[PDB]
Amino acid sequence: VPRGSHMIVKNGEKWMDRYEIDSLIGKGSFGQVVKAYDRVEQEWVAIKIIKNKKAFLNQAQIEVRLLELMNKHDMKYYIVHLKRHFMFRNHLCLVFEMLSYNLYDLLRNTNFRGVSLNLTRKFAQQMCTALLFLATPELSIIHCDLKPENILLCNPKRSAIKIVDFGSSCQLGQRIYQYIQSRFYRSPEVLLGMPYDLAIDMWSLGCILVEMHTGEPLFSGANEVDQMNKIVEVLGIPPAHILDQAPKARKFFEKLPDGTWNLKKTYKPPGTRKLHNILGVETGGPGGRRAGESGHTVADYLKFKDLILRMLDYDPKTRIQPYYALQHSFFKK
Ligand SMILES: Cc1nc2ccc(-c3cc(N)nc(N)c3)nc2n1C[C@H](C)Oc1cccc(Br)n1
């Protein structure tokens, strides 16, 4: 008799005379991931096991529908492929291609020194092409949980990547959750309790590309208030037209009589932490480690910093969209 929501995983057991369970290869809020051998297909698979709990089951039904939608608009370009799903022992089970480790593990492999600007640019091209495909009118899909941990290497030897975990994903106009995105990668509009569109994913990507090159999160807030303050340190006070609509503006800011917003009394002065110095543009890159190294020139750093600031625009209406981000000078050969 199953106790609560957990499937009890036993290694070596064979499910429906097809899946030979090998090991637990991951765990999350939604349940767990197992490495399994598919006898029929004669190959390795990762099976996401959804917890036998109603909230998680409903969200995983939306994951199957969106994964099926995306996989039907194919050949494969940058989204994890859903092979099939089935009910087993009262758990919904999602079968995926066996993949390599996540981009946070890749950073930990090189002691958080960071990947080269050349590798950062290859990850940025695949991510922007992926966000371009999500923005397709037939899809209009918001990932909502972009982070290094939901970006997987196909193979440890190459740089090809796939986006995984559409567990909190929604389509444009089907927002159902106030509280979304991992805090470090959480957009201003989500912190402010505002409605969101596909632009919140471009905000996550900006934060992610800086972290891959520096080896550290751009915005490492301990809580929502700390997170907002860390963003203001770099980007300054948000435009008044945005704060005037934000339900949670008075969680971090206060209106003055003359009608200008400032930070709640109780960090660097707003906008004084320059991305220019965080990238060490003129002083040899992150911790000065890329000094003189080929492909890390001041000119190369200026194009990258330019593209990142367009990704971190406070206005979702003027935040660079996937198509225009691919036309950026940071990508021309
Ligand atoms: C080796 C491998 N191939 C995979 C293929 C797909 C998935 C996967 C995982 C989740 N949460 N959602 C989807 N839609 C697909 N996960 C794979 N994994 C484990 C991966 C490295 O770890 C990960 C990655 C993310 C979450 C967790 Br826990 N662990």
Swiss-Prot record:
It is found in: Nucleus; Nucleus speckle. The modification Phosphoserine is found at residue 168. It comes from the Eukaryota. The modification Phosphotyrosine is found at residues 19, 37, 77, 177, 179, 301. ATP binds at residues 25-33, 48, 96-99. The active site is at residue 145. Belongs to the protein kinase superfamily. CMGC Ser/Thr protein kinase family. MNB/DYRK subfamily. This is Dual specificity tyrosine-phosphorylation-regulated kinase 1A. The gene is DYRK1A. The chain holds residues 148 to 481 of 763 of the full protein.
